[PDB]
Design an enzyme around this catalytic site. Sequence first.
Site, short mmCIF file in Angstrom:
data_model
loop_
_atom_site.label_atom_id
_atom_site.label_comp_id
_atom_site.label_asym_id
_atom_site.label_seq_id
_atom_site.Cartn_x
_atom_site.Cartn_y
_atom_site.Cartn_z
N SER A 128 0.84 -1.18 0.00
CA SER A 128 0.00 0.00 0.00
C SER A 128 0.88 1.24 0.00
O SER A 128 0.69 2.16 -0.80
CB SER A 128 -0.91 0.00 1.23
N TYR A 130 1.65 3.29 -3.01
CA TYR A 130 0.64 4.10 -3.68
C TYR A 130 0.58 5.50 -3.10
O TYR A 130 -0.19 6.34 -3.57
CB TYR A 130 -0.72 3.43 -3.61
N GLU A 185 -3.84 -9.05 -2.68
CA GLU A 185 -4.62 -7.86 -2.98
C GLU A 185 -6.04 -8.24 -2.64
O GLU A 185 -6.47 -9.33 -3.01
CB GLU A 185 -4.57 -7.51 -4.46
C1 LIG Z 1 -4.72 2.98 -4.74
C2 LIG Z 1 -4.32 1.71 -4.07
N1 LIG Z 1 -4.31 0.63 -4.77
C3 LIG Z 1 -3.96 -0.59 -4.24
C4 LIG Z 1 -3.97 -1.79 -5.04
O1 LIG Z 1 -4.32 -1.80 -6.41
C5 LIG Z 1 -3.59 -3.01 -4.43
C6 LIG Z 1 -3.24 -3.06 -3.07
C7 LIG Z 1 -3.23 -1.89 -2.28
C8 LIG Z 1 -3.60 -0.65 -2.88
C9 LIG Z 1 -3.61 0.65 -2.12
O2 LIG Z 1 -3.30 0.66 -0.92
N2 LIG Z 1 -3.98 1.76 -2.78
#
Ligand SMILES: Cc1nc2c(O)cccc2c(=O)[nH]1
Length: 350
Positions: A243, A246, A327
């Site tokens: 995470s 991101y 995920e």
């Molecule tokens: C925007 C975002 N995308 C994620 C993802 O595609 C997969 C796993 C985690 C994340 C995340 O924390 N934020």
Amino acid sequence: KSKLAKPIQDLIKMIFDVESMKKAMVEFEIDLQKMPLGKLSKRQIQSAYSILNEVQQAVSDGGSESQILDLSNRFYTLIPHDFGMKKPPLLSNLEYIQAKVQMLDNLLDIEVAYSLLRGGNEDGDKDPIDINYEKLRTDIKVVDKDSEEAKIIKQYVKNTHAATHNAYDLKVVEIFRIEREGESQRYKPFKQLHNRQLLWHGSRTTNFAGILSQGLRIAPPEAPVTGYMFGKGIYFADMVSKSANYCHTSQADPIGLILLGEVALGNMYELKNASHITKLPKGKHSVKGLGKTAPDPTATTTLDGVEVPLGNGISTGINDTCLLYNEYIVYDVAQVNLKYLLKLKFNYKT
Ligand SMILES: Cc1nc2c(O)cccc2c(=O)[nH]1
């Protein structure tokens, strides 16, 4: 002056910083001269999504090159870009189109932040900070650094920082207990589900005024399903490492924000490869992309009846998977209830 605690003041000032909004738009390569912060509209972003959707269809199905050219020109005229001294790339590469779908996801949140910022600010009997905090309609409180609640979350951060993502350390600067208006109520029906976990969600700081006021949400009807790995849902992770990426922080901008939400997973539809999911199989409540690494199931704890995978990054027995980490995707905006917001400091290895 502000009645709010200092950490919260610093948070509001940070999520509503105009300079960061422009920096984000410049990184997406938008022309800020032709497209100022205040020109952004929801209608505009909707249309851009529709355009990206058609062009995606033409590339996949072998539509005329004239079609792809026309669509690119309309997209670039709707959202003016600045490529400097280089020629503008055509929306003919499926990866570039995916890059562009992601830009629109962010612009949706940036547009919310600016609208709120220029909103009802006439009140002189309140401090600007207090006024903007109220616009979020989210009760924010500082979690005590020495309490069990905080201890567990720090353990979750430390233990789940993946091996390949050790291009930086992570220090928890501050932890906030957040409660969005009416969110506990829309999530009530899901307390009936099993396998409710405390997962992670990272994003740019520029998206937080949007996330807090509107909550996390699935992409609009116009967005192509293809623009997302497991379709149009809400993504989470069990490794802080995944995470954290991101957040889009850097050596020059090291503070990132990251959420911890309770997510009602129920029976997961396990996948080893991407899949542009539209329908969820009967009896399934969410999707789970399997990774090569996941927290140790031995160490799993509970926090208010919610499973917390704070175990150390162990390698799972699955080898035929495309993902490095798990995920989790839910397809209903009510299957999640946000709990904590952490202020993280990324210490980059130099
Ligand atoms: C925007 C975002 N995308 C994620 C993802 O595609 C997969 C796993 C985690 C994340 C995340 O924390 N934020």
